[PDB]
Amino acid sequence: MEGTGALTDYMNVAQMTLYAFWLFLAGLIVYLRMEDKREGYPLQAEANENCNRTPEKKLGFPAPPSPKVFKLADGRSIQVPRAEKTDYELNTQLRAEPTAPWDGAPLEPTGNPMVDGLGPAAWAKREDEPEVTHGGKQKICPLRVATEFEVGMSRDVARFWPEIDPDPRGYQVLGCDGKVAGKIVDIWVDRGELRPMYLEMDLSGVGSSGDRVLLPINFARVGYDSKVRVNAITGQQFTDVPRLREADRISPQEEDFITGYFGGGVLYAVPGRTEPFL
Amino acid sequence: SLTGLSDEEAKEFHSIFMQSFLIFTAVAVVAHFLAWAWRPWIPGAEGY
Amino acid sequence: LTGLSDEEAKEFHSIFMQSFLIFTAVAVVAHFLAWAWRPWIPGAEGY
Amino acid sequence: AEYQNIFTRVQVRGPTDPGVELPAADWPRTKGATHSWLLGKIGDAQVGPIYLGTTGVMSILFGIVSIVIIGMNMLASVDWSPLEFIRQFFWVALEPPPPEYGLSLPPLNDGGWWLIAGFTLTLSVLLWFARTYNRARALGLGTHVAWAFAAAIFLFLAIGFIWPVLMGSWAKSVPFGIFPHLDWTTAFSLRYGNLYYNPFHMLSIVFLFGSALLFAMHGATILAAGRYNAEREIEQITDRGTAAERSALFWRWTMGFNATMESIHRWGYWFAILCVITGGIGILLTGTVVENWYLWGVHHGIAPEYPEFFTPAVDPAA
Amino acid sequence: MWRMWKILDYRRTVVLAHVGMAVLALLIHFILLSTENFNWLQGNPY
Amino acid sequence: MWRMWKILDYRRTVVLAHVGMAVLALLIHFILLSTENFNWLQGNPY
Amino acid sequence: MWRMWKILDYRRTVVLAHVGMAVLALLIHFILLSTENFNWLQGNPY
Amino acid sequence: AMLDFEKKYRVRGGTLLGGDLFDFWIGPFYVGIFGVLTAIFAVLGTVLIIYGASQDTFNLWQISIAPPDLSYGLALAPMMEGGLWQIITVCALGAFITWALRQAEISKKLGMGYHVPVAFAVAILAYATLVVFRPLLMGAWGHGFPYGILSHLDWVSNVGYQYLHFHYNPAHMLAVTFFFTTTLALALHGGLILSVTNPKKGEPVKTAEHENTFFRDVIGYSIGSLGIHRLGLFLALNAGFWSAVCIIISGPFWTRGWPEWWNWWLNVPIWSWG
Amino acid sequence: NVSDEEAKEFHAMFSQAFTVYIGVAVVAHILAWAWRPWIPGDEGF
Amino acid sequence: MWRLWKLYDPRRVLIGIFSWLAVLALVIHFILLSTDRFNWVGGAAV
Amino acid sequence: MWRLWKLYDPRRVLIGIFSWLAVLALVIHFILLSTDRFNWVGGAAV
Amino acid sequence: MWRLWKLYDPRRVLIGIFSWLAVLALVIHFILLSTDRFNWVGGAAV
Amino acid sequence: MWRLWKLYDPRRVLIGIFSWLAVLALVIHFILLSTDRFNWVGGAAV
Amino acid sequence: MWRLWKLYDPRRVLIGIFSWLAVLALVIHFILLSTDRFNWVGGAAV
Numbered sequence A: 001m002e003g004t005g006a007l008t009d010y011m012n013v014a015q016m017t018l019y020a021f022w023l024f025l026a027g028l029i030v031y032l033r034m035e036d037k038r039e040g041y042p043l044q045a046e047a048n049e050n051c052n053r054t055p056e057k058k059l060g061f062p063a064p065p066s067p068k069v070f071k072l073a074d075g076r077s078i079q080v081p082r083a084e085k086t087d088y089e090l091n092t093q094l095r096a097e098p099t100a101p102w103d104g105a106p107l108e109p110t111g112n113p114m115v116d117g118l119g120p121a122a123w124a125k126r127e128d129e130p131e132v133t134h135g136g137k138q139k140i141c142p143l144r145v146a147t148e149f150e151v152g153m154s155r156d157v158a159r160f161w162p163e164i165d166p167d168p169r170g171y172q173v174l175g176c177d178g179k180v181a182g183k184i185v186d187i188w189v190d191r192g193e194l195r196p197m198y199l200e201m202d203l204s205g206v207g208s209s210g211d212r213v214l215l216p217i218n219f220a221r222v223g224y225d226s227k228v229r230v231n232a233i234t235g236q237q238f239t240d241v242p243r244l245r246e247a248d249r250i251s252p253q254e255e256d257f258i259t260g261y262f263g264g265g266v267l268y269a270v271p272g273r274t275e276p277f278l
Numbered sequence B: 001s002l003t004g005l006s007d008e009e010a011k012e013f014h015s016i017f018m019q020s021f022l023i024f025t026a027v028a029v030v031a032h033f034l035a036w037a038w039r040p041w042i043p044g045a046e047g048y
Numbered sequence C: 001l002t003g004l005s006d007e008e009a010k011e012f013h014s015i016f017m018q019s020f021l022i023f024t025a026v027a028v029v030a031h032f033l034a035w036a037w038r039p040w041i042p043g044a045e046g047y
Numbered sequence D: 001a002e003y004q005n006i007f008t009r010v011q012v013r014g015p016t017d018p019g020v021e022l023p024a025a026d027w028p029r030t031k032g033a034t035h036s037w038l039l040g041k042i043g044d045a046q047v048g049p050i051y052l053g054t055t056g057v058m059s060i061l062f063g064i065v066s067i068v069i070i071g072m073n074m075l076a077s078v079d080w081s082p083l084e085f086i087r088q089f090f091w092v093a094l095e096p097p098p099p100e101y102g103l104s105l106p107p108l109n110d111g112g113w114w115l116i117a118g119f120t121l122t123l124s125v126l127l128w129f130a131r132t133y134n135r136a137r138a139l140g141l142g143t144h145v146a147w148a149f150a151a152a153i154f155l156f157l158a159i160g161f162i163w164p165v166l167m168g169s170w171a172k173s174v175p176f177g178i179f180p181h182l183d184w185t186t187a188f189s190l191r192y193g194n195l196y197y198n199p200f201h202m203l204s205i206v207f208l209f210g211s212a213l214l215f216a217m218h219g220a221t222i223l224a225a226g227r228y229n230a231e232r233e234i235e236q237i238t239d240r241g242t243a244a245e246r247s248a249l250f251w252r253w254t255m256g257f258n259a260t261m262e263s264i265h266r267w268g269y270w271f272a273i274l275c276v277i278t279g280g281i282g283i284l285l286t287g288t289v290v291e292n293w294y295l296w297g298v299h300h301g302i303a304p305e306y307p308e309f310f311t312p313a314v315d316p317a318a
Numbered sequence E, F, G: 001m002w003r004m005w006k007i008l009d010y011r012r013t014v015v016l017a018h019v020g021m022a023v024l025a026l027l028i029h030f031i032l033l034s035t036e037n038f039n040w041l042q043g044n045p046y
Numbered sequence H: 001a002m003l004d005f006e007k008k009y010r011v012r013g014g015t016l017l018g019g020d021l022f023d024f025w026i027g028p029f030y031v032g033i034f035g036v037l038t039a040i041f042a043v044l045g046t047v048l049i050i051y052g053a054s055q056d057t058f059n060l061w062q063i064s065i066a067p068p069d070l071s072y073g074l075a076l077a078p079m080m081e082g083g084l085w086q087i088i089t090v091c092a093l094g095a096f097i098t099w100a101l102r103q104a105e106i107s108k109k110l111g112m113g114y115h116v117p118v119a120f121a122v123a124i125l126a127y128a129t130l131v132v133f134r135p136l137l138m139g140a141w142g143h144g145f146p147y148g149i150l151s152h153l154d155w156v157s158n159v160g161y162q163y164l165h166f167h168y169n170p171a172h173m174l175a176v177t178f179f180f181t182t183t184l185a186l187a188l189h190g191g192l193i194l195s196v197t198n199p200k201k202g203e204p205v206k207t208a209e210h211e212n213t214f215f216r217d218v219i220g221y222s223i224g225s226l227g228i229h230r231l232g233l234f235l236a237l238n239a240g241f242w243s244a245v246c247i248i249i250s251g252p253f254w255t256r257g258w259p260e261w262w263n264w265w266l267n268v269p270i271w272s273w274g
Numbered sequence I: 001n002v003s004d005e006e007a008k009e010f011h012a013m014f015s016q017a018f019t020v021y022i023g024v025a026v027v028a029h030i031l032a033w034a035w036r037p038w039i040p041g042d043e044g045f
Numbered sequence J, K, L, M, N: 001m002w003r004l005w006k007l008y009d010p011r012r013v014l015i016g017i018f019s020w021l022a023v024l025a026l027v028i029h030f031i032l033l034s035t036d037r038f039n040w041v042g043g044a045a046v
């Protein structure tokens, strides 16, 4: 053909602009997949996957990039993927047995999967130092120390329509089996996220009234009848929720312990959840 | 709950509200009488 | 205020006015050359 | 019966966050900040304060001038009737210059007001770019938002300024109206032979559809892993929690490959800005180096061929 | 009238005045360029 | 029949009632404005 | 009716009154411009 | 091979069907019963597509499996007259539905909510609107779109111009608004997260304080870490849903030009001015 | 959490407001009918 | 009916009424302007 | 049959019934408005 | 009337007044540019 | 050749083999339904 | 006048001035390229 844009008898400028973008899109796709390989890589090929019956490491394609250094606010240059998390995962002895020796067989937990961190109950290896705001305050703290927060975004809504702006303090907690686990005594708020994160409760229903346990808010269904319904775990199972090292702080690790325990209830709280519909 | 407002103060607001509504409607009715005197808005059988 | 003493403020101003004068003077020469080329102020009849 | 992380049930209100301290040359922020219960259900309840600096003020002034010019010309076209303005609100427009003016400056009522509105609108969006750039730098953040905005600016400039300039007439540009700029969009495709066959329009749609696909995938995944504080994504990038692992494992088990807490936002960022960049390139190619996009597709063997169903029409003026 | 600078911030009034006059100067110069009687570059008859 | 208000919340029932009755009343008034025999402003024959 | 300011916040009411009257005055003036008999800048016979 | 943290999560359970029989991983993919089904459906549909391609042309863009003639109504057609399209439709529908059920098995196993399968059910709803629901209401499977990279673009073009200006479709303007707004939100969300975790070199990784401060500095509002993902999901799902609405009302509930639909707006008694 | 006394008082405010609103609307429909009846006959209006 | 204000906050009722009255009077005045017969500034004959 | 309310919340039921009745009543009315025999405002003849 | 400046920040009131005057003056000037009689740059006769 | 099962689990190869057979049988049966000569239910002649 | 630099950062003012000059120069040069008299590369005659 002829006209403006012709490069040969067949090639034209728009077509070669397109292939130019193909080369860029590939280089971007390869670059994006490398950024994908900074967590969990290199892959751990177990012995039972390889014909030589030896554990190995697979880079995949594209191979992972070099380690990446995140300088942190408190003056700590962390490298990603983090060495301590990889070392914890590779050395932890799981309390589970594969349902079959071949690769891809699911693990069947031996003891109690909820307290052993198996499957939906699992936790990552995180820091034990409680998080801080940019200004140095305690990031996730209960309302008894984070006294500048009051429950309820709108005072008028909380006073005249408390159903849609509730205050769950003093609410009874029920498990997936309808049994009473205790009473909510406090609310934990993230000073950065400006949201409730945990509902601290006592175990007055299934244990000691003086015991304190954190219930993650995303596992709590704060009702309209002064009852909080947790579908994750049975009411009797609130006693084994991991306790805080310090009654007034939570490390990111304990957040993974506590949310992990409730997440494990989705499969292990009662018999039959693991079992299919049919 | 309830609006924080005295039982007598609630009677006071209502009295002014009903006097203001009555004055508002009293002006509206006169305005309507003036408009109907201009051009009536309820047509007859054959229209206007 | 910004981190300038009365001396550093004056030192900046002297160089600033010198740069501004030179930039303007070059521009003025460019405008005299352009007017010599084609004036941009038409008469009542136009161009 | 499980909580679906769709609305925030329990909210907690504290003092208004005045924002992170700025350097000691920035303008003071506004003093106005209030909390909204309705907005607090979806997310952060605080409304305001807002910063306004040199770039922000000048962007607002240039933009207000543009909106006043468009609005007053729109209102003038309906003989200044506010009622007729509402009746014709989607149909009125500030019309671009007619083709006879080329790239020259046309009279105010013959596209001159359009050219001034386009110039001030271009200045306001460019200053707003500098504002987004500087607000990130003032907080010590990367300039990713500004460059993503710059990518959207480039399509805006390609459509309205660069392509009409490459074509040699302001008539080719898009009028400031709701239905009229939809008329421009359709007529553009009619004129240059079905923009569907433009490959960079195809790629533009790939990244646009992939952007909605990605936000739906990512937003659903963060809500699904909200039980493990997935939405605190900055903590998960610097300290991989179980939520980051369950999000990655979910997609690794589904489609065989995953991302990280950080790399997902690189995928979404590039999909958003590639949509608008291939869009700009596709617009710049048509009219300039491709006359008819269906004929271009026929040449490169991409046009489907259709068997006989009707008697083909013949041009009487052939 | 220096008491005006005990109400308004002279630092941000100066910035605002300069950017405000910039918008108006471009607007007026461009309006004049879009008229037949005052586009000094087109030079139409007066 | 006062027991209706031990069932619903009376405060929100009244607010909902006003908004619903406003929407319905504008619905009916506009519908009559679109008919020919009941458009009292148009004043067509009956 | 000085008690009205123990109900309505006077600072916000004053501002919203000026904003609201700005829209209404502009709207009424614009409506008169659109009519033939009351556009003072057009000067049609009355 | 597995991610270095992946092993502890690979447990038994979470299936809806199949139980232990299909509850395993092949490489990185979890299989499940709906993975076997989605594999059979996907391979069947893809191989049937290639067979249809072998009968007209192998050019990738020009491959087209077209729906049957409208004269066929809802009857199943001969294979080379749109019956091949109909089988591919039931294969693709099954492939999509078992994909979402499989993502539901993966959701339960990792203790996640069902947001992903449900958000995908909206995408499946839009395809079902395109090939099942709208062809049903109009009365023929031939109203669905052909399965071809460039032949389905002509379908979109012609179906859009069946209403003479498809930009005036009120539900389409809403869906386009949701599509444009969600990629705008995706640009802001992706950019802001990268801007915090990747600040200027020599700066610490910032906080959620800086994220809220940035958008309060720019637009005067910040939706927060949690709000951006609710809104992001909301905008994209409304984009899919209003796509379904805009196409389901084009022909079953509107047969005229879409610009004419706005005649009610032009006739509102408030602002007729005549 | 609404008592019998609160419920009775609410229904008195409801009764008084329902009575006026119905009584006026019935008068509105009588005037509307006296103007142009809205139920057509076999031949129309 | 004095108890109506022990339930409903006077400010919100008055703001709601004022918003309804403003919208309603604007809508009625606009509807009249849209008709040929009651457009008082359009100056038509009956 | 009173045991029905032991299993179902009266507010939820009455809200659901009224939303069903309101929508069903609206739809039947609008279906009758679109016919040629039961369009009462349109004044159609048999 | 002087107590207004205790109710509001005078800086805010001035900024709001000026911002309003600037838009109002521009709207008025644009209006006069629209009409034949008062378009001064167009220079049309009477 | 028995040692192939020291490498692949009998459950997985059988699931994959049977899935392959199901796909294959349907593709071949459907391809025959596409052809005019082997569409047995269509029943063309030779 | 030198007291300007205590009020403002020299880097910010220089970046602002230079960005204004670059855009002003770009705008003026483009405006001249669009006319038929001062388009120098076009070589149009007077």
Ligand code: BCL
Pocket (backbone or CB within 6 Å): D185, D186, H096, H123, H124, H125, H126, H127, H129, H130, H155, H156, H157, H158, H159, H160, H161, H165, H166, H167, H172, H175, H176, H179, H239, H240, H242, H243, H244, H246, H247
């Ligand atoms: C001239 C033609 C008309 C027009 C006619 C039409 C017609 C006809 C339609 C649209 C539709 C759309 N139009 Mg339109 N449209 C026009 C111009 C535009 C313009 C523009 C630039 O002006 C824009 C931005 C849009 C935007 C849109 C969207 C709102 C919508 C498409 C998104 C969608 O449906 O998602 C939905 C996403 C899907 C349906 C994808 C389904 C995903 C399934 C579930 C999974 C598939 C998996 C896949 C097989 C996996 C592959 C294998 C692996 C990769 C290995 N249109 C012009 C004016 N438009 C469509 C719509 O709304 O339908 C719902 C539609 O039918």
Ligand code: BCL
Pocket (backbone or CB within 6 Å): F013, F014, F015, F016, F017, F018, F019, F020, F021, F023, F024, F027, I013, I014, I015, I017, I018, I021, I022, J001, J004, K022, K026
């Ligand atoms: C000074 C005192 C207050 C006042 C104090 C009270 C008190 C106290 C009460 C009322 C109540 C009412 N008031 Mg009042 N009211 C005032 C002055 C007025 C004026 C006026 C012009 O002055 C009007 C018209 C009204 C009107 C009303 C009615 C809404 C209601 C009485 C009828 C009823 O029983 O509703 C009952 C009808 C329903 C509950 C039906 C619900 C409406 C539903 C939602 C509509 C569904 C259909 C609709 C078509 C859906 C639209 C969908 C479309 C497809 C778009 N009030 C003044 C301002 N008023 C009563 C009330 O609210 O009852 C609950 C009541 O108790």
Ligand SMILES: CC[C@H]1c2cc3[nH]c4c(c3C)C(=O)[C@H](C(=O)OC)c4c3nc(cc4[nH]c(cc(n2)[C@@H]1C)c(C(C)=O)c4C)[C@@H](C)[C@@H]3CCC(=O)OC/C=C(/C)CCC[C@H](C)CCC[C@H](C)CCCC(C)C
Pocket (backbone or CB within 6 Å): D209, D212, D213, D216, D217, D220, D254, D255, H038, H041, H042, H043, H044, H045, H046, H088, H091, H092, H095, H096, H099, H103, H116, H117, H119, H120, H122, H123, H146, H147, H148, H149, H150, H152, H236, H237, H239, H240, H241
């Ligand atoms: C509704 C909001 C947006 C959205 C959401 C969304 N999509 C999703 C999801 C979500 C939440 C997933 O979880 C799921 C996923 O896991 O993605 C990685 C998915 C997905 N969306 C996909 C694609 C996709 N989404 C699209 C759109 C959208 N997805 C919306 C804009 C489009 C468009 C607009 O065209 C495409 C192409 C896949 C990547 C994936 C679903 C994968 C799947 O279902 O796999 C099943 C097995 C297969 C191999 C599919 C093919 C099997 C068939 C028998 C053959 C092909 C038939 C088909 C009719 C051919 C048509 C071709 C012609 C049109 C050219």
Ligand SMILES: CC[C@H]1c2cc3[nH]c4c(c3C)C(=O)[C@H](C(=O)OC)c4c3nc(cc4[nH]c(cc(n2)[C@@H]1C)c(C(C)=O)c4C)[C@@H](C)[C@@H]3CCC(=O)OC/C=C(\C)CCC[C@H](C)CCC[C@H](C)CCCC(C)C
Pocket (backbone or CB within 6 Å): D059, D060, D061, D062, D063, D064, D067, D124, D125, D126, D128, D129, D132, D145, D146, D148, D149, D150, D151, D152, D272, D273, D276, H180, H181, H183, H184, H187, H188, H191, H218, H219
């Ligand atoms: C990746 C490409 C996508 C994208 C990205 C994108 N857009 C962006 C950004 C990014 C990354 C920004 O950072 C920027 C932004 O601010 O985001 C919130 C923006 C933005 N994208 C916007 C719009 C937008 N983006 C679009 C599209 C897209 N944006 C792409 C799909 C579109 C479409 C689909 O057409 C639109 C319409 C803006 C909301 C914003 C940039 C705003 C801007 O430039 O404004 C300039 C200034 C004005 C217009 C001045 C007038 C404004 C007010 C009227 C002034 C008020 C005056 C006074 C303060 C008050 C007066 C009233 C009194 C009574 C108080």
Ligand SMILES: COC(C)(C)C/C=C/C(C)=C/C=C/C(C)=C/C=C/C(C)=C/C=C\C=C(C)\C=C\C=C(C)\C=C\C=C(C)\C=C\CC(C)(C)OC
Pocket (backbone or CB within 6 Å): D067, D068, D070, D071, D072, D074, D075, D115, D117, D118, D119, D120, D122, D156, D157, D159, D160, D161, D173, D174, D175, D176, D177, D178, D181, L027, N027, N030, N031, N034
């Ligand atoms: C009367 O109204 C008042 C005052 C009350 C306020 C109301 C205002 C209203 C209601 C305004 C309504 C506005 C609307 C609805 C606008 C709709 C706008 C739309 C849909 C626009 C869509 C697309 C428009 C585009 C893409 C425009 C592109 C134009 C461009 C990019 C122009 C570029 C021009 C440049 C850079 C100018 C260069 C000038 C130079 C100097 C180069 O010339 C020599």
Ligand SMILES: CCCCCCCCCCCCO[C@@H]1O[C@H](CO)[C@@H](O[C@H]2O[C@H](CO)[C@@H](O)[C@H](O)[C@H]2O)[C@H](O)[C@H]1O
Pocket (backbone or CB within 6 Å): H072, H073, H074, H075, H076
């Ligand atoms: C678990 C899922 C179960 C499957 C669900 C199937 C739902 C979708 C099908 C709904 C019913 C469709 O009903 C379909 O109507 C068409 C009418 O055009 C019938 O078609 C019939 O009449 C047409 C003419 O009208 C004849 O040419 C044709 O030979 C004859 O079969 C189909 O025989 C029937 O299948």
Ligand SMILES: [Fe+3]
Pocket (backbone or CB within 6 Å): D218, D222, D233, D265, H189, H193, H229
């Ligand atoms: Fe995110």
Ligand SMILES: [Mg+2]
Pocket (backbone or CB within 6 Å): D175, D180, D181, D183, D184
């Ligand atoms: Mg047009």
